[PDB]
Write a protein that binds this ligand. Structure first.
Ligand SMILES: [K+]
Ligand SMILES: [K+]
Ligand SMILES: [K+]
Ligand SMILES: [K+]
Ligand SMILES: [K+]
Ligand SMILES: [K+]
Ligand SMILES: [K+]
Ligand SMILES: [K+]
Ligand SMILES: [K+]
Ligand SMILES: [K+]
Ligand SMILES: [K+]
Ligand SMILES: [Mg+2]
Ligand SMILES: [Mg+2]
Ligand SMILES: [Mg+2]
Ligand SMILES: [Mg+2]
Ligand SMILES: [Mg+2]
Ligand SMILES: [Mg+2]
Ligand SMILES: [Mg+2]
Ligand SMILES: [Mg+2]
Ligand SMILES: [Mg+2]
Ligand SMILES: [Mg+2]
Ligand SMILES: [Mg+2]
Ligand SMILES: [Mg+2]
Ligand SMILES: [Mg+2]
Ligand SMILES: [Mg+2]
Ligand SMILES: [Mg+2]
Ligand SMILES: [Mg+2]
Ligand SMILES: [Mg+2]
Ligand SMILES: [Mg+2]
Ligand SMILES: [Mg+2]
Ligand SMILES: [Mg+2]
Ligand SMILES: [Mg+2]
Ligand SMILES: [Mg+2]
Ligand SMILES: [Mg+2]
Ligand SMILES: [Mg+2]
Ligand SMILES: [Mg+2]
Ligand SMILES: [Mg+2]
Ligand SMILES: [Mg+2]
Ligand SMILES: [Mg+2]
Lengths: 127, 98, 206, 100, 84, 153
RNA sequence: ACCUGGUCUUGACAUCCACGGAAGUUUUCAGAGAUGAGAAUGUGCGAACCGUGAGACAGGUGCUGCAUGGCUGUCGUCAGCUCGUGUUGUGAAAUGUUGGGUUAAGUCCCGCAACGAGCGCAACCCUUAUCCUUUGUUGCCAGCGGUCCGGCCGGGAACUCAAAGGAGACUGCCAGUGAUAAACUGGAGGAAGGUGGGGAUGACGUCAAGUCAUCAUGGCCCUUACGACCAGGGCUACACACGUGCUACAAUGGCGCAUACAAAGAGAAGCGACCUCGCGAGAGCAAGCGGACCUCAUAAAGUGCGUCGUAGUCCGGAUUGGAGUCUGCAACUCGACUCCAUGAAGUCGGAAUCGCUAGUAAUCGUGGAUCAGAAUGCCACGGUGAAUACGUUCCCGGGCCUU
């Protein structure tokens, strides 16, 4: 049947649907190479598949919202990993060994009073 | 169908009104859809605390407006008159739409 | 240094608001200004009625004022005569139908606003500031407070150099958010200027 | 603020309502694309005759409790100082110290 | 500057002052505080005395002063250089 | 830091070649967080370098590193009296970090057209012990040579 | 709040009394206006509301922050600061609070003439990272069924999400180490591991620190004036010196075309679509929205293709001329923005000096408060996304013991 995974990264969240196939990937009704023009983003998306050796045994249906290129690419990689574990449960050990199961919780630090940014202070002068 | 939109500064006070709006409605015939938790608004304010200078010394405040949506589909006749006379608690804004 | 207001920091945690209505931007500023004029009148009229807290609500095109007090008979008067005299002034000010409710402050020795006002009236009568603060602290500790702190600042005893003095008994854990800390202030207008009083009263963690 | 300065704003608020409709139709003429060229001229000259204090741009928001002309906040009608005092006393509904 | 669809601005009290003196031979200086008034093609000749904050300075209106405001001919600040 | 609580951060391997070594070099070259702009510059210079020699992009890159990596450097050491520039052994990781930083710094100083060409001419001279970067490695070895007497402080 | 001139004196703002008058509307002249003189119309429902006349008084952003309250900065989010009883000392004082370990921590354990307690630390609060339950529109689209291919429609409650209630992390588990202690080092499981990240939270006190111009207030001072009203000017001056920023000096770029991916927020005297007109800022017409619905509102960096080819340039955009738009009684002094033309310094900055340890710095856009109009400031939001930390001798600030 269909297998599902929810992935999140920065302000992005990806819905992933995994089913046996031949290796075709759709992201927001576009192809992988059409959606992600950045070469790093394409490698991030694939990374779980090159690891478990199920690259061309599956079909990927994926919708994403929010964030940017690297966030969505990373968000898909997380939800993909959560889909494969709903597929086979013996993959958790090798996926976690690759750092793919962890939800990356790094977010933008808020701007604070008296600072120019989250941490950049205004220029100081003794006199 | 009539639309029920509920506003309040306290989400505990807003759940009391919703719990008694969807209770004085299923009894009196009509059935209900919801309640729906619409997105809370967060209005923010930043003020200088010192009466004079000290620009970096500030207090940051916030008012949260909670929102609720209740759908009374197929309103019976005993249902309608059983709504304006409920008299909800203070600090709960109620808007009736048709 | 400077400390956060003990009431404000707990307003959603263990302390309730003193005004509990809802309004959009269109009338939010006008409701605040009418609450101000109402409290300004009630506080001046009921100066000798031990008014601790004036809570204002606005159900629907009407205002409901709840006066917490320790001398309710003085607030009400004979057969509800006086409480009626205010129910008219409040409607005049608020511009909506008015309704007044009288709450009971039992043990005024455990209410920060009343304790602060007690000390302040004594200072305007030229009572020794030291005697007033000790009495207030001993009273509240005897009635079962878990702690109390009283602070007095200004030209104490008409001294030329102003200073601050404070006493404390029991626990007053101001950094614990879930601590029931009743806090209020008051001002005395002596012949040498203003003396400020602050009172913290701890009643147990919730 | 001084008492005189407070009374200057109540006058400017009254005069802005008494001449409200009389000011709006004059600018209707002046802004009118297909009016004439001499009534426009008359409407322009007539607008200058109304007292200056009748224009809403002559008003300055002031703290409703002190009269302070700086640090105003429209949602509360108070200066930044009085907003803080009322907020900590719990006299502003729903308003608490924010943190995110 | 002022939008063309509104025409140049003129203070109405000054417009009466130039009317009552172009038809007559009044060569007396016109004392005005209306530095905001555009100079019109109708008082090329007489002297308007414009206020600069502390007195009225006479400007002899010619043709080339048309389109300018009166204040452009009455400087408000007094400068002579530092240590000069 | 005083407390020594600083572990290590994982770096992704570069896309085209899967070399973490090369991915750090893109990072040293990157400005303003524009990583893709730096990825392209490195790839173009690497191909000009791959056809200027017979080796692959990597083997030509390593040969450039081997001629720029310093082995010993000098660090100051204030002790009871004055400060001597003590020669210290450069740890294997810092060897690569210094080699890359000097290459990128030397290439930015040239006067060719693009940065992809400048980086190519520096990576090529580094294979022949010419140009800056390689010279910077020579100046460091000389300083550490003239201070070998202080090799116990 | 200042200046010049024009003006008032129980008074612009209160109360009291006397007397006049409903209050209001509608126009004329003089004057820069304040104001003065009128001239019409209403006279309703005492007491509203106006005018005048007296004197108690009002009024003061006038002085003293070294008379004060309140509020704030600061050492410093540093780990400290104390008290009761006991004991020691003629006494000031000491002990506790020191010691052995340990911790981010006066954190904890052990010892101990101390035994206990308080204020601080931590915890309780907000937020962010995982999951569950409920609810399913204005939000959602997996399987369906149609389709103008638009979740567009029928439906669907799965999912993303919205917001309520729960679950979760405790050095709990395992091993070693250690004084059979506190703890530490590492491993497992897990979204998260040792205070998970960020915020709020500021002990006793210090600087007679800041604020009598937010407000309040003792005292002092002015009262036909230091009070009040008006017009114009000033706070925008300019040999110069400093602080904080913005934009650059270019090719990791400029310009042209095409083409992706955000978060957060605001709106009724408001936000304003569509359409048409304008080179453009805008204009006319006019929907929708008190909003998960409508509007603001195209994110930009990015990517593809072209071009420029190292030049004071197709870099840079200061300055100035001309012509306009919009807000507003009114843009001369002194507004923002648009168009055409002009095309300054500047080619990486002396001595010196500042910020930052990770989603940080750097860089890229977006919003909001104030506000008729008027941000390169402030407050907030996401996109991209580094380098480096061997170590604690030195510089600066601080903590503990000792001399
Ligand atoms: K003070
Ligand atoms: K002794
Ligand atoms: K003792
Ligand atoms: K004073
Ligand atoms: K001015
Ligand atoms: K700036
Ligand atoms: K140029
Ligand atoms: K201007
Ligand atoms: K510089
Ligand atoms: K504005
Ligand atoms: K010492
Ligand atoms: Mg950012
Ligand atoms: Mg909203
Ligand atoms: Mg005053
Ligand atoms: Mg204004
Ligand atoms: Mg004068
Ligand atoms: Mg002081
Ligand atoms: Mg003794
Ligand atoms: Mg100590
Ligand atoms: Mg001691
Ligand atoms: Mg010890
Ligand atoms: Mg402790
Ligand atoms: Mg001990
Ligand atoms: Mg704490
Ligand atoms: Mg289908
Ligand atoms: Mg572990
Ligand atoms: Mg603070
Ligand atoms: Mg001082
Ligand atoms: Mg001073
Ligand atoms: Mg002063
Ligand atoms: Mg003026
Ligand atoms: Mg200024
Ligand atoms: Mg250019
Ligand atoms: Mg706005
Ligand atoms: Mg030059
Ligand atoms: Mg050049
Ligand atoms: Mg740090
Ligand atoms: Mg920016
Ligand atoms: Mg310590």
């Amino acid at each position: 049947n269909q297998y599902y995974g929810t992935g999140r990264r920065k302000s992005s969240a990806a819905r992933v649907f995994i089913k046996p196939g031949n290796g075709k990937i759709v992201i927001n009704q576009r192809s992988l190479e059409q959606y992600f023009g950045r070469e790093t983003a394409r490698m991030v998306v694939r990374q779980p598949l090159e690891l478990v050796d199920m690259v061309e045994k599956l079909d990927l249906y994926i919708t994403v919202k929010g964030g940017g290129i690297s966030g969505q690419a990373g968000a898909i990689r997380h939800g993909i990993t959560r889909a494969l574990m709903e597929y086979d449960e013996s993959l958790r050990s090798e996926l976690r060994k690759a750092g793919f199961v962890t939800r990356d919780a790094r977010q933008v630090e808020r701007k604070k009073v008296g600072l120019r940014k989250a941490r950049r202070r205004p220029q100081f002068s003794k006199r | 169908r009539i639309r029920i939109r509920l506003k309040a500064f306290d989400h505990r006070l807003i759940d009391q009104a919703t719990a008694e709006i969807v209770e004085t409605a299923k009894r009196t015939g009509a059935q209900v859809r919801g309640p729906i938790p619409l997105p809370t608004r967060k209005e923010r304010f930043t003020v200088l605390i010192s009466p004079h200078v000290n620009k970096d010394a500030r207090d940051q405040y916030e008012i949260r407006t909670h929102l609720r949506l209740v759908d009374i589909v197929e309103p019976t006749e005993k249902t309608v008159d059983a709504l304006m006379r409920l008299d909800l608690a203070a600090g709960v804004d109620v808007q009736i739409s048709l | 240094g400077q400390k956060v207001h003990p009431n404000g920091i707990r307003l959603g945690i263990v302390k309730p608001w003193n005004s509990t209505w809802f309004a959009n931007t269109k009338e939010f500023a006008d409701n605040l200004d009418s609450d101000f004029k109402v409290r300004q009148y009630l506080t001046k009229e009921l100066a000798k009625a031990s008014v601790s807290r004036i809570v204002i609500e606005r159900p629907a095109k009407s205002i409901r004022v709840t006066i917490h007090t320790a001398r309710p008979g003085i607030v009400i008067g004979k057969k509800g005569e006086d409480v009626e005299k205010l129910r008219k002034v409040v409607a005049d000010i608020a511009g909506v139908p008015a309704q007044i409710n009288i709450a009971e402050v039992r043990k005024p020795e455990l209410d920060a606003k009343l304790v602060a006002d007690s000390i302040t009236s004594q200072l305007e009568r030229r009572v020794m500031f030291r005697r007033a603060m000790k009495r207030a602290v001993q009273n509240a500790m005897r009635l079962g407070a878990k702690g109390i702190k009283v602070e007095v600042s200004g030209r104490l005893g008409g001294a030329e150099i102003a200073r601050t003095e404070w006493y404390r008994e029991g626990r007053v854990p101001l950094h614990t958010l879930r601590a029931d800390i009743d806090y209020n202030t008051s001002e005395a207008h002596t012949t040498y200027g203003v003396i400020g009083v602050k009172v913290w009263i701890f009643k147990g963690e919730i | 603020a001084k008492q005189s300065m407070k009374a200057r704003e109540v006058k400017r608020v009254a005069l802005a309502d008494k001449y409200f409709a009389k000011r709006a139709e004059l600018k209707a003429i002046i802004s009118d694309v297909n009016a004439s060229d001499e009534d426009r001229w008359n409407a322009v000259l007539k607008l200058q005759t109304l007292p200056r204090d009748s224009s809403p741009s002559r008003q300055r928001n002031r703290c409703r409790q002190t009269g302070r002309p700086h640090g105003f906040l429209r949602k509360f009608g108070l200066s930044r100082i009085k907003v803080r005092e009322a907020a900590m006393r719990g006299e502003i509904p729903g308003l608490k110290k924010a943190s995110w | 500057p002022r939008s063309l669809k509104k025409g140049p601005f003129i203070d109405l009290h000054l417009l009466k002052k130039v009317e009552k003196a172009v038809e007559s031979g009044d060569k007396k200086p016109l004392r005005t505080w209306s530095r905001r008034s555009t100079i019109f093609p109708n008082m090329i000749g007489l002297t308007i005395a414009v206020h600069n904050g502390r007195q009225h300075v006479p400007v002899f209106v010619t043709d080339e002063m048309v389109g300018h405001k009166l204040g452009e001919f009455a400087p408000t600040r007094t400068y002579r250089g530092h240590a000069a | 830091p005083r407390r020594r609580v600083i572990g290590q951060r994982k770096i992704l391997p570069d896309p085209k070649f899967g070399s973490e070594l090369l991915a750090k070099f893109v990072n040293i070259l990157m400005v303003d967080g524009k990583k893709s702009t730096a990825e392209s510059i490195v790839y173009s210079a690497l191909e000009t370098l791959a056809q200027r020699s017979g080796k692959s992009e990597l083997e030509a890159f390593e040969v450039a590193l081997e001629n720029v990596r310093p082995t010993v450097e000098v660090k100051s050491r204030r002790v009871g009296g004055s400060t001597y520039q003590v020669p210290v052994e450069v740890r294997p990781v810092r060897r690569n970090a210094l080699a890359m930083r000097w290459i990128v710094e030397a290439a930015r100083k040239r006067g060719d057209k693009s940065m992809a060409l400048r980086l190519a001419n520096e990576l090529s001279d580094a294979a022949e012990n010419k140009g800056t970067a390689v010279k910077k490695r020579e100046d460091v070895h000389r300083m550490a040579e003239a201070n070998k007497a202080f090799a116990h402080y």
